[PDB]
Design a protein around this motif. Structure first.
Motif, PDB file in Angstrom:
ATOM      1  N   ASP A  41     135.502  68.417  65.294  1.00 31.73           N
ATOM      2  CA  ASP A  41     134.546  68.837  66.315  1.00 31.73           C
ATOM      3  C   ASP A  41     133.337  67.911  66.359  1.00 31.73           C
ATOM      4  OD1 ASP A  41     135.906  70.862  67.507  1.00 31.73           O
ATOM      5  OD2 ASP A  41     134.689  72.500  66.699  1.00 31.73           O
ATOM      6  N   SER A  57     144.189  69.416  67.208  1.00 36.35           N
ATOM      7  CA  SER A  57     143.687  68.093  67.520  1.00 36.35           C
ATOM      8  C   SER A  57     144.871  67.218  67.469  1.00 36.35           C
ATOM      9  CB  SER A  57     142.738  67.624  66.436  1.00 36.35           C
ATOM     10  OG  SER A  57     141.635  68.497  66.268  1.00 36.35           O
ATOM     11  N   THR A 102     144.570  63.998  68.210  1.00 40.54           N
ATOM     12  CA  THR A 102     144.045  62.634  68.189  1.00 40.54           C
ATOM     13  C   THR A 102     143.615  62.212  66.810  1.00 40.54           C
ATOM     14  OG1 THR A 102     141.934  63.541  68.847  1.00 40.54           O
ATOM     15  CG2 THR A 102     143.398  62.693  70.539  1.00 40.54           C
ATOM     16  N   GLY A 103     143.203  63.158  66.000  1.00 36.41           N
ATOM     17  CA  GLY A 103     142.823  62.903  64.626  1.00 36.41           C
ATOM     18  C   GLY A 103     141.323  62.911  64.415  1.00 36.41           C
ATOM     19  N   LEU A 104     140.613  63.692  65.225  1.00 35.83           N
ATOM     20  CA  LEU A 104     139.172  63.848  65.113  1.00 35.83           C
ATOM     21  C   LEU A 104     138.842  65.314  64.874  1.00 35.83           C
ATOM     22  CD1 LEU A 104     138.579  61.880  68.395  1.00 35.83           C
ATOM     23  CD2 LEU A 104     138.005  60.889  66.176  1.00 35.83           C
ATOM     24  N   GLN A 149     133.153  64.736  65.520  1.00 35.26           N
ATOM     25  CA  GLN A 149     133.486  63.416  66.045  1.00 35.26           C
ATOM     26  C   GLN A 149     133.582  63.434  67.565  1.00 35.26           C
ATOM     27  OE1 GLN A 149     137.085  62.553  63.838  1.00 35.26           O
ATOM     28  NE2 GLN A 149     135.956  61.485  62.220  1.00 35.26           N
ATOM     29  N   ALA A 150     134.260  64.439  68.125  1.00 29.39           N
ATOM     30  CA  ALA A 150     134.351  64.551  69.577  1.00 29.39           C
ATOM     31  C   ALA A 150     132.988  64.826  70.197  1.00 29.39           C
ATOM     32  CB  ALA A 150     135.344  65.648  69.959  1.00 29.39           C
ATOM     33  N   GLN A 151     132.188  65.686  69.562  1.00 28.48           N
ATOM     34  CA  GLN A 151     130.849  65.975  70.055  1.00 28.48           C
ATOM     35  C   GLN A 151     129.948  64.749  70.050  1.00 28.48           C
ATOM     36  OE1 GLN A 151     129.567  69.644  68.453  1.00 28.48           O
ATOM     37  NE2 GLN A 151     127.760  69.833  69.770  1.00 28.48           N
ATOM     38  N   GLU A 152     130.086  63.867  69.062  1.00 26.23           N
ATOM     39  CA  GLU A 152     129.328  62.623  69.037  1.00 26.23           C
ATOM     40  C   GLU A 152     129.856  61.583  70.013  1.00 26.23           C
ATOM     41  OE1 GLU A 152     129.209  61.383  64.916  1.00 26.23           O
ATOM     42  OE2 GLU A 152     128.074  63.200  64.440  1.00 26.23           O
ATOM     43  N   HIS A 159     131.347  62.241  72.892  1.00 28.18           N
ATOM     44  CA  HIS A 159     131.099  62.694  74.255  1.00 28.18           C
ATOM     45  C   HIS A 159     129.725  62.303  74.780  1.00 28.18           C
ATOM     46  CE1 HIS A 159     132.716  64.747  77.617  1.00 28.18           C
ATOM     47  NE2 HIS A 159     131.892  65.779  77.601  1.00 28.18           N
ATOM     48  N   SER A 160     128.744  62.138  73.892  1.00 31.29           N
ATOM     49  CA  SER A 160     127.379  61.846  74.318  1.00 31.29           C
ATOM     50  C   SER A 160     127.295  60.498  75.025  1.00 31.29           C
ATOM     51  CB  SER A 160     126.440  61.884  73.113  1.00 31.29           C
ATOM     52  OG  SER A 160     126.765  60.867  72.182  1.00 31.29           O
TER      53      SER A 160
END
Ligand code: BCL
Ligand code: BCL
Ligand SMILES: CC[C@H]1c2cc3[nH]c4c(c3C)C(=O)[C@H](C(=O)OC)c4c3nc(cc4[nH]c(cc(n2)[C@@H]1C)c(C(C)=O)c4C)[C@@H](C)[C@@H]3CCC(=O)OC/C=C(\C)CCC[C@H](C)CCC[C@H](C)CCCC(C)C
Ligand SMILES: CC[C@H]1c2cc3[nH]c4c(c3C)C(=O)[C@H](C(=O)OC)c4c3nc(cc4[nH]c(cc(n2)[C@@H]1C)c(C(C)=O)c4C)[C@@H](C)[C@@H]3CCC(=O)OC/C=C(\C)CCC[C@H](C)CCC[C@H](C)CCCC(C)C
Ligand SMILES: COC1=C(OC)C(=O)C(C/C=C(\C)CC/C=C(\C)CC/C=C(\C)CC/C=C(\C)CC/C=C(\C)CC/C=C(\C)CC/C=C(/C)CC/C=C(\C)CC/C=C(\C)CCC=C(C)C)=C(C)C1=O
Ligand SMILES: COC(C)(C)C(=O)C/C=C(\C)CC/C=C(\C)CC/C=C(\C)CCCC/C(C)=C/CCC(C)CC/C=C(/C)CCC=C(C)C
Ligand SMILES: COC(C)(C)C(=O)C/C=C(\C)CC/C=C(\C)CC/C=C(\C)CCCC/C(C)=C/CCC(C)CC/C=C(\C)CCC=C(C)C
Ligand SMILES: COC(C)(C)C(=O)C/C=C(\C)CC/C=C(\C)CC/C=C(\C)CCCC/C(C)=C/CCC(C)CC/C=C(\C)CCC=C(C)C
Ligand SMILES: COC(C)(C)C(=O)C/C=C(\C)CC/C=C(\C)CC/C=C(\C)CCCC/C(C)=C/CCC(C)CC/C=C(\C)CCC=C(C)C
Ligand SMILES: COC(C)(C)C(=O)C/C=C(\C)CC/C=C(\C)CC/C=C(\C)CCCC/C(C)=C/CCC(C)CC/C=C(\C)CCC=C(C)C
Ligand SMILES: COC(C)(C)C(=O)C/C=C(\C)CC/C=C(\C)CC/C=C(\C)CCCC/C(C)=C/CCC(C)CC/C=C(\C)CCC=C(C)C
Ligand SMILES: COC(C)(C)C(=O)C/C=C(\C)CC/C=C(\C)CC/C=C(\C)CCCC/C(C)=C\CCC(C)CC/C=C(\C)CCC=C(C)C
Ligand SMILES: [Fe+3]
Lengths: 325, 51, 273, 44, 51, 255, 51, 44, 51, 44, 51, 44, 44, 51
Positions: free
Chosen positions: D9, D3, D5-7, D11-14, D16-17
């Motif tokens: 799984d 990562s 960016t500093g997130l 955080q990215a999954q939330e 992306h929604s």
């Protein structure tokens, strides 16, 4: 982006500089009074003046003013003393050289006398200015390179105005004093004696003019590039080499395989600039006196190109086809 | 949400890339306006000599 | 063979592309990605020019002529003997000039100085491209470009100038000529002043910037300074190039009649009695 | 995993929604506009 | 397609969003200026059209 | 007019004479420009086997002002550096060099400086040419934005201190240096920045060449009222070296 | 003649090899081109004529 | 012993041997090509 | 002839390889272009004429 | 021993072996192509 | 032939891959344009002439 | 061993394997395209 | 083993899997568009 | 194939993605413009042809 050093960010102003002096006592003839221009301070220095007033300068100023007034009053009288018409036709008037029928004799005032008088005044003024530029360098203890480079252009000036009319035996071979008339003289001179493109010395002068413009562009860009290392103080770099000179030389050595020094580039610049009027005057002096047709000269000397295709529009298209009918 | 992780995990110049993107669309916009000065006024030529 | 002060500057890095694949020197020359491209394009162009010269029937330097196609071919491709070689050589020359400029950029980046020289070269490249690309594109045929001959590229200039009756009456031509003359005069004065300051009469000490400032203030009443003169010269040369390009580009696609007639706006103003 | 960016799984999954919900709505609006324009004056 | 959310693990989200908005605005500009075509496509003009 | 033989006339004679003169002039101009940097050397510091087709010129003497002696060229290299921390990356010639330690601290590459004289440059009166604005009588700001009192931002967005003074060129009425007072976090003392590497704004002055952590190692002047040529070279080049060595991304290909 | 090997005590082989290669390629290209500017030895035109 | 390139006598001999070895091969190939060309279209 | 391998004690491969790579492509491109400019060996016009 | 590039004898021999291996393949492909071209359109 | 893998002991693959890609794309574009510049192989014009 | 890049023997072999696999795939695709083009409009 | 970017092996495999998954969808959409265009107006 | 994943041990994903996006967008724009510059493949006027 990074600062490019084209305009100054902040200006500072101090007491005015009056100039250096020595036992020659340059102060006795210098004026008193100076000004400051903030508009010009964005590019160069802001102080304006003072100026040195000798005898050569005063003579040149007065005599050039006389020439200017003679030409202007003749042009004004040629139009009926009408100020609106004088303004309307300013770019079209001139003071014409004498007629070809008078040879080298003095013509009447209506057909070239005022032209000769004004030309005499202009010659005197130019020679006075050259003498002044020599005298100033002689009194400040410097070299006389400025005088030589002025004499380089004065040579072409004299060839165009004095030597060639005498060699051709007529005062009608000079140049009229006008804006559009002098361009007309240029074109007519080019047409009358063949093609001036095929004069080799015109080509040499063009070569040196192009080289001089290219060289100032290159040198200005190079000096502005290394100005972060104090590269604009060229004299101290010449006396004590620094990193700016080394980087400037290495750039051109890596670019084209050879370079110069901080003092040697100015010799290149001086010669490319000086060699243009010299070659131009040499080429002009040979026209008519020696060669009367330059295209025929090129043909006889075998460097005139040959073409195979035909002439005329009917060999390529049709008049109706051009119009779209 | 929880936060925008914009405390110490976001030392970022949020606009840097977009400025470049906008500058890119600037020179491609002025080229059309420059070529617009001359193309609507078309010109035709008639050859009278060798190539 | 290096200069006595060159070795410490010969470090690695500062490449736009290529890394250490092309990071070395050949003699004095510096090689890179753009050096390779420049060599390829220049060699191809030169060999094609000499092939065309061989097929023309003459190897005389004064008489070699490679010409653009006829106006009937339009903007399409012509047979390689009837003017297509000219198009190929034009493409090669454009590539070589761009590669040369980018190589200069890389050298500037490696030496840690400013990028003024490539910017100045870009103006000459712009003028050439205006001559061979933009004006023929606007006029509608590749046959409006000048031929590649030492003495045959002056006949083109003469005929193009005489196509408007009197080309001296073009105002942009006037501006460009004035800029050229001013640049030459400024260069002469700058060189003379520097040389005179550094070379006094025998038995005399050298001079400094104060002496030059005094001289020109005594001479003409104003001095531009040791830094403003370089700015002035660079600006004059760039302006000359730009106005030459403008003068050539307005002659064909914008104006069609003779140039002397353009002054009828001044000659027929309502203010005159 | 990796990562820059500093997130994580989650955080990215939330995050992306929201992007997918927007993209999938901005496009429906574009489809309606395109259908209206086609009804106006067809270009095939 | 199930694991397309990992692009944010590589790219900063907000820098992406601003550039995306700028690019979309410029794209919409052009398509509306090209659709200013005098065929069956220009509608701003309605005065010299069918009034 | 007539011809001497064949097609040879006065114009041809003038052309050939000009050819000869131009050849001699080119020889003279090229030879005049070989007074610095010769003879050539190889990559091991030894004299190269090839020296070119132009032989070295003869000697000339410069008589310097203020009793600083005379200079004769061409001669020995007095600006030569002694011990350079560099390493060859190949066994032959034509390949780059590799820094051994810290290139910004070792003065190699774009951070290289020349060994100039350790004396200040003098004006016509014999005074130091560059003087702080607090010691120049009658000088003041006449245009632009005054940078004194404004904070200084580094190349990575860090504020390191305030502008406290300007060093001006009294003879030419031009600003040369900007003085900086460092915060205790970022170092101690004062440092100089050349005017050509700064961008003055309404509320700040930005230096993009180097970062915040590189400000404590800027070379310092020995005297608070003057600067020598050697110090100017080291300060000015240290600032130039940051365009390449301040980050790893500035050295690798941009692509 | 038996001492012609002492030329390499004067000239560096690295430069000599490069110069010789450039010279040889240029000479070969010039000769091959000069043969093509005639009619008796131009093999392309001869091939065209014999068919 | 004169030496501007820093070589030794034995090194020069060993270099010249291979140089002449290559030169003779180049000349032989050129001679064969010239003979074939003369057989094809004479010039003398 | 059996000692030709000693050239690699004179030249570094890193420069020779790039020089040869440029030279071979230059040669191939010129030769193909020279062939394309004739009438008997131009394979593009031959196909059009044959059809 | 003379060595400008710093290589030894064995390294140079190996490098020459690989270089010759590449050269022969290039020449063979060129020869096949030339034979096909000559069969298609002779130039002699 | 079986020892051609040693080329990567001379050249860096990172700096070779990019150049190879650029060269391949430029060659493909040049060949497609050269085909487009003729009459027999201009597939945009055969579509119009056939219909 | 000799190395100007820093790689070893095994790494170079491993890289060359994949490079040649990609080259073969590219060549096969190009061959199929050329065959289709020749069938459509034959040169030679 | 060889890693110029500092990435491990499993992460590279996962990244390549995702990249291939995206590429296949892009290619499928392009193929559908090309088929529709050819049906509308053939170029062969 | 099978081992093509190792390309990500050589190239940095961020620059690769940026370059890929720029190249794809430029290629698509060029192809659409080239289609627009023809006669048989301009969809704005073909509807008027069948109107
Ligand atoms: C009947 C003739 C008309 C006339 C017709 C024209 C026409 C027509 C033109 C001008 C142009 C010009 N005219 Mg006019 N002009 C006339 C007579 C004059 C007179 C005069 C009577 O005194 C003057 C002073 C000029 C001067 C000028 C300049 C203002 C200008 C030149 C362009 C230039 O320098 O761009 C310089 C820029 C370049 C093109 C440089 C390009 C360099 C490239 C990029 C690099 C070269 C690389 C090289 C191949 C490297 C190989 C070398 C290696 C070492 C092997 N004209 C007469 C009245 N004039 C020209 C112009 O404005 O062009 C735009 C032009 O075409
Ligand atoms: C149809 C036009 C003909 C042509 C006809 C001529 C003629 C005729 C001449 C030129 C000349 C020149 N031509 Mg030509 N020329 C043509 C086409 C071109 C083209 C082109 C097409 O691009 C170019 C580049 C040029 C350019 C040039 C220059 C190379 C050269 C000018 C020399 C010089 O230094 O002038 C700079 C000007 C001077 C130095 C004049 C002297 C100045 C003096 C010192 C002034 C004193 C000051 C004054 C008294 C005080 C003023 C008031 C102050 C404010 C106080 N020509 C065509 C073919 N050309 C000249 C030359 O030498 O040719 C051989 C010349 O006479
Ligand atoms: C291209 C070079 C030619 C030239 C240039 C030249 N002369 C100049 C300048 C320049 C560029 C000045 O800037 C300077 C000047 O004061 O210009 C207004 C000047 C000058 N050259 C002069 C004369 C002169 N130069 C000559 C020579 C030449 N002039 C050259 C041939 C000649 C000739 C041919 O015989 C003459 C007669 C003086 C008029 C002037 C010398 C200045 C001086 O002695 O006092 C000026 C100072 C002041 C008392 C105050 C400033 C003057 C302002 C006009 C008034 C107030 C304005 C304000 C302070 C700012 C100005 C704004 C700016 C936009 C100018
Ligand atoms: C190497 C060749 C180049 C060259 C060089 C050159 N010219 C030079 C010099 C040199 C080295 C000088 O030293 C000299 C000079 O003073 O330069 C500043 C000069 C000079 N070259 C000049 C002009 C000039 N040079 C030209 C060209 C060139 N000169 C070449 C390109 C050209 C052209 C046609 O291209 C021209 C027109 C002058 C500016 C100057 C010569 C000054 C001179 O001779 O003055 C004599 C005095 C008079 C005629 C009196 C004039 C009186 C006026 C009516 C009023 C007073 C002047 C006032 C400043 C003007 C009006 C101002 C308004 C505000 C009222
Ligand atoms: C104060 O400050 C300043 C300085 O400082 C103090 C300066 O100095 C200067 C500079 C000013 C001057 C020196 C004054 C003189 C200048 C002029 C009169 C200007 C006009 C100049 C010229 C007419 C000359 C310009 C010459 C040029 C452009 C040609 C030179 C170029 C080449 C020979 C080729 C370039 C080489 C390249 C690209 C590298 C090779 C490529 C490769 C791929 C390498 C691979 C290997 C091979 C291909 C094989 C080996 C290659 C070889 C041997 C190369 C040669 C090949 C041939 C075919 C011949 C200025 C302005 C300055 O203000
Ligand atoms: C005919 O020929 C020419 C050339 C003229 C053409 O017309 C050619 C045209 C093309 C080739 C066009 C091609 C166009 C494309 C490929 C376009 C693609 C566009 C997209 C993929 C757009 C996607 C947009 C998605 C959006 C807007 C979705 C959601 C957005 C939001 C929900 C906004 C809020 C977002 C977030 C994350 C919350 C904010 C939080 C923060 C922390 C910043
Ligand atoms: C006719 O002649 C002319 C010249 C006019 C032409 O038109 C010539 C044209 C050509 C020569 C054209 C040539 C075209 C090509 C060579 C095209 C090649 C195209 C590609 C190789 C395209 C590849 C596209 C790949 C795509 C779109 C991939 C997308 C992937 C993803 C969206 C997945 C996102 C990735 C993530 C989230 C990473 C996951 C992260 C983790 C940490 C696990
Ligand atoms: C007809 O009129 C015109 C003008 C048109 C002409 O065409 C005129 C033409 C001429 C006047 C042409 C003249 C031509 C010449 C004089 C040409 C001369 C050419 C040569 C002398 C060429 C010599 C070449 C020699 C070579 C290639 C020999 C050997 C090379 C090698 C062996 C390379 C390998 C070297 C190694 C391994 C040395 C290393 C050894 C160690 C021990 C380290
Ligand atoms: C007809 O008239 C005109 C002028 C038109 C002409 O056309 C004239 C034409 C000519 C004059 C043409 C002249 C042509 C030549 C002289 C051509 C010469 C060509 C060569 C000498 C080619 C050599 C090619 C060699 C190759 C391909 C060798 C090897 C290639 C490899 C890929 C091997 C790489 C090696 C490795 C990896 C070694 C690594 C080993 C380690 C131990 C690390
Ligand atoms: C007709 O006349 C004219 C002039 C008009 C012409 O058209 C002339 C044309 C020519 C003369 C053309 C000449 C063309 C060539 C010589 C072309 C040559 C092309 C190649 C040699 C292409 C090679 C391609 C190689 C490829 C694609 C290889 C591999 C690709 C991969 C994707 C493999 C990826 C590798 C990985 C992942 C390795 C990672 C491994 C680890 C261990 C980390
Ligand atoms: C930056 O890096 C990353 C990895 C992120 C990327 O590369 C990201 C890339 C993207 C986000 C890319 C996104 C791309 C898109 C959103 C693309 C979308 C494309 C379309 C929606 C295309 C639609 C095209 C439709 C066309 C051409 C329709 C044509 C119709 C007709 C011509 C009508 C005739 C049809 C008939 C008769 C029906 C017959 C059809 C059949 C299928 C039978
Ligand atoms: C009346 O209204 C007022 C008061 C406002 C005026 O005074 C108005 C004034 C004007 C509007 C004036 C306008 C002036 C011009 C437009 C002038 C233009 C002048 C030229 C273009 C002059 C060119 C001169 C010279 C040229 C081109 C070349 C060479 C010339 C010479 C060498 C001259 C020297 C002459 C000699 C040596 C011959 C002398 C004769 C003897 C017998 C010794
Ligand atoms: Fe200078």
């Amino acid at each position: 982006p990074e600062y490019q050093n084209i305009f100054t960010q902040v200006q500072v102003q101090g007491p005015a500089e009056l100039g250096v002096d020595n036992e020659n006592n340059l102060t006795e003839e210098r004026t008193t009074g100076t000004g400051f221009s903030q508009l010009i301070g964005w590019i160069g220095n802001a102080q304006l003046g003072p100026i040195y007033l000798g005898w050569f300068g005063i003579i040149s100023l007065v005599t050039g003013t006389l020439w200017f007034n003679i030409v202007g009053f003749n042009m004004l009288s040629q139009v009926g003393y009408s100020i609106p018409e004088f303004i309307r036709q300013l770019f079209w008037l001139a003071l014409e050289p004498p007629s070809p029928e008078y040879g080298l004799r003095m013509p009447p005032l209506d057909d070239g006398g005022w032209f000769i008088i004004a030309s005499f005044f202009l010659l005197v003024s130019v020679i006075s200015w050259w003498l002044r530029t020599y005298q100033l360098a002689e009194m400040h203890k410097m070299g006389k390179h400025v005088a030589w480079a002025f004499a380089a252009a004065i040579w072409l000036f004299l060839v165009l105005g004095l030597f060639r009319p005498i060699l051709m035996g007529s005062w009608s071979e000079a140049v009229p004093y006008g804006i559009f008339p002098h361009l007309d003289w240029t074109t007519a001179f080019s047409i009358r004696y063949g093609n001036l493109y095929y004069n080799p010395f015109h080509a040499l002068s063009i070569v040196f003019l192009y080289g001089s413009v290219l060289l100032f562009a290159m040198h200005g860009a190079t000096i502005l590039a290394v100005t972060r290392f104090g590269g604009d103080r060229e004299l101290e770099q010449i006396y004590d080499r620094g990193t700016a000179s080394e980087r400037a030389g290495l750039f051109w050595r890596w670019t084209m395989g050879f370079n110069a020094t901080m003092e040697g580039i100015h010799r290149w610049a001086w010669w490319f600039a000086v060699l243009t009027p010299i070659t131009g005057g040499i080429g002009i002096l040979l026209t008519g006196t020696v060669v009367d047709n330059w295209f025929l000269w090129a043909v006889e000397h075998n460097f005139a190109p040959d073409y195979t295709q035909d002439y005329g529009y009917e060999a390529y298209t049709t008049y109706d086809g051009f119009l779209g009918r | 949400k929880w936060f925008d992780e914009w405390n110490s995990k976001n030392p970022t110049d949020i606009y840097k890339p977009a400025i470049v993107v906008g500058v890119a669309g600037g020179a491609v916009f002025a080229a059309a306006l420059l070529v617009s000065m001359g193309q609507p006024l078309a010109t035709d030529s008639m050859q009278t000599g060798p190539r | 063979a290096l200069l006595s002060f060159e070795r410490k500057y010969r470090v690695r890095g500062g490449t736009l592309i290529g890394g250490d694949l092309f990071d070395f020197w050949v003699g004095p020359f510096y090689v890179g990605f753009f050096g390779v491209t420049t060599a390829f394009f220049a060699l191809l162009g030169t060999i094609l020019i000499f092939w065309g010269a061989s097929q023309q029937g003459t190897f005389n330097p004064w008489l070699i002529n490679i010409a653009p196609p006829d106006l009937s071919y339009g903007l399409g491709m012509a047979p390689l003997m009837e003017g297509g070689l000219w198009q190929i050589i034009t493409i090669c020359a454009i590539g070589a000039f761009v590669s040369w400029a980018l190589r200069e950029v890389e050298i500037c980046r490696k030496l840690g100085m400013g990028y003024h020289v490539p910017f100045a070269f870009s103006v000459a490249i712009f003028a050439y491209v205006t001559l061979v690309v933009f004006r023929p594109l606007l006029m509608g045929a590749w046959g409006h470009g000048f031929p590649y001959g030492i003495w045959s590229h002056l006949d083109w200039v003469s005929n193009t100038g005489y196509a408007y009756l009197h080309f001296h009456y073009n105002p942009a031509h006037m501006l460009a000529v004035t800029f050229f003359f001013t640049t030459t005069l400024a260069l002469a004065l700058h060189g003379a002043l520097v040389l005179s300051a550094a070379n006094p009469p025998k038995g005399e000490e050298v001079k400094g910037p104060d002496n030059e400032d005094t001289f020109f203030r005594d001479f003409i009443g104003y001095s531009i300074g040791t830094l403003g003169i370089h700015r002035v010269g660079l600006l004059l040369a760039l302006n000359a190039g730009f106005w030459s390009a403008v003068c050539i580009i307005i002659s064909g696609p914008v104006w069609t009649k003779g140039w002397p007639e353009w002054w009828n706006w001044w000659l027929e103003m309502p203010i005159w009695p | 995993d990796l990562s820059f960016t500093g997130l994580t799984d989650e955080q990215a999954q939330e995050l992306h929604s929201v992007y997918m919900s927007g993209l999938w709505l901005f496009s429906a609006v574009a489809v309606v506009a395109h259908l209206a324009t086609f009804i106006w004056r067809p270009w095939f | 397609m199930s694991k397309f959310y990992k692009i944010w693990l590589i790219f900063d989200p907000r820098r992406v969003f601003v550039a995306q908005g700028v690019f979309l605005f410029l794209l919409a500009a052009m398509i509306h200026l090209v659709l200013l075509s005098t065929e069956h496509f220009n509608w701003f003009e309605l005065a010299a059209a069918n009034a | 007019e007539e011809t001497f033989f064949g097609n040879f006339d006065l114009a041809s004679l003038s052309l050939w004479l000009f050819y000869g003169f131009f050849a001699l002039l080119i020889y003279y101009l090229q030879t005049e420009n070989m007074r610095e940097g010769y003879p050539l050397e190889d990559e091991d510091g030894n004299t190269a086997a090839n020296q070119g087709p132009f032989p070295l010129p003869k000697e000339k003497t410069f008589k310097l002002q203020h009793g600083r002696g005379e200079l004769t060229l061409p001669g020995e290299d007095v600006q030569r550096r002694d011990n350079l921390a560099l390493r060859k990356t190949a066994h032959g010639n034509g390949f780059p060099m590799e820094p051994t330690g810290d290139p910004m601290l070792d003065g190699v590459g774009p951070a290289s400086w020349s060994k100039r004289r350790d004396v200040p440059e003098l004006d016509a009166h014999g005074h130091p040419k560059i003087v702080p604005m607090s010691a120049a009588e009658g000088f003041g700001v006449s245009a632009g934005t005054d940078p004194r009192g404004l904070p200084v931002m580094a190349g990575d967005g860090e504020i390191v201190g305030l502008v406290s003074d300007m060093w001006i060129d009294e003879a030419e009425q031009l600003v040369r240096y900007l003085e900086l007072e460092l915060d205790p976090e970022w170092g101690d003392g004062k440092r100089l920045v050349q005017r050509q590497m700064v961008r003055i704004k309404s509320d700040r002055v930005k230096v993009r060449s180097i970062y915040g952590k590189h400000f404590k190692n800027v070379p310092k002047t020995k005297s608070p009222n003057q600067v020598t040529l050697l110090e100017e070279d080291k300060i000015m080049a240290y600032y130039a070296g940051g365009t390449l060595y301040a980050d790893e991304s500035r050295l690798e290909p941009q692509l």
